[PDB]
């Protein structure tokens, strides 16, 4: 909560309180210390406000994604169906492929499900969209075949798909690491500034 505004004089003081003698060395040094303190406080405020705003925004984003039941490359969603989770883990980590146990109609259905899921997940700006769609199109072309005969034909596209996939994974990991490092550096700097301000307040003079 806030404080009430400070009190003001009722009678008008224009310049009667102005000093009639130039300042002294100690007063000059105290003014310099005050300026240093205000700069330190400005830096601390910047750090604190940035940290607070980012934390709030990101927690809100997390709550929104959890509310709309989203799942990303890091599969950290418990409300998923086992089938959806298997399909997403195949798209992210494994190899999408239709089994020989299924009938041709069920294979077509499975490929359509893969395509729908992946197209809703990846937009046109996403790099992996074209390789994924190409691999699924190769699957559609090679439905009426066995996995052994389908591998030789779809490997050339699955390679690019897996490459883009691993690239995204590495991007995510590097982002986490770099953000941690930057955050820790900023927090350490803020702590050091706080201690410097503490010593300057112990040294400050006036009333």
């Amino acid at each position: 909560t806030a404080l009430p505004p400070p009190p003001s004089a009722n009678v008008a003081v224009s310049f009667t309180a102005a000093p009639a003698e130039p300042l002294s060395r100690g007063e000059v040094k105290a003014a310099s210390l005050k300026l240093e303190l205000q700069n330190i406080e400005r830096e601390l405020k910047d750090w604190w406000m940035s940290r607070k705003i980012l934390r709030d925004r990101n927690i809100g984003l997390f709550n929104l994604l959890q509310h709309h039941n989203f799942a990303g490359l890091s599969v950290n969603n418990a409300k998923l169906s086992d089938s959806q989770r298997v399909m997403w883990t195949d798209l992210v980590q494994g190899k999408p492929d239709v089994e020989d146990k299924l009938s041709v109609d069920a294979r077509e259905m499975k490929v359509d499900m893969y395509e729908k899921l992946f197209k809703q997940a990846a937009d046109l700006e996403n790099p992996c969209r074209m390789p994924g769609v190409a691999y699924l199109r190769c699957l559609r072309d090679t439905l009426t075949e066995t996995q052994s005969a389908r591998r030789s034909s779809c490997l050339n596209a699955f390679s690019s798909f897996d490459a883009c996939r691993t690239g995204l994974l590495k991007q995510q990991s590097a982002a986490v690491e770099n953000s941690l490092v930057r955050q820790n550096m900023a927090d350490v700097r803020a702590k050091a500034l706080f201690e410097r301000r503490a010593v300057l307040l112990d040294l400050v003079e006036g009333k």
Partner: protein, 112 residues
């Protein structure tokens, strides 16, 4: 009964306020003063005369042009001291234990 006072009647409301169980001295409201320029002006005058800051601070005195003192503190001195003793002994006059002194003072001050 107590009707709203528009903003145009506030200057008269300040120097002729409505009646209350604890009213001020309306005849003395124009005499309430507290100068915020006392010490600044004193310092300015002394430094213009030629004194130093230390001499000015030693010669400084508090303002005498403040709200006048209540004459009751000098006229009803003994009765007030007795009432304060009664209060200190009887827990602030709970359940009418200093009515005696309070009524004596009220009569002395009002006279019907």
């Amino acid at each position: 009964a107590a009707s709203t006072i528009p903003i145009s009647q506030w200057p008269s409301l300040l120097y002729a306020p409505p009646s209350s169980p604890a009213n001020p001295a309306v005849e003395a409201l124009p005499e309430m003063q507290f100068d915020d320029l006392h010490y600044p002006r004193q310092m300015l005058l002394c430094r213009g005369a030629g004194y130093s800051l230390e001499q000015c601070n030693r010669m400084a005195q508090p303002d005498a042009r403040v709200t006048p003192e209540n004459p009751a503190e000098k006229l009803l001195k003994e009765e007030a001291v007795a009432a304060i003793a009664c209060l200190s002994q009887r827990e602030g006059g709970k359940d009418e234990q200093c009515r005696y002194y309070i009524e004596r003072m009220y009569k002395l001050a009002n006279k019907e």
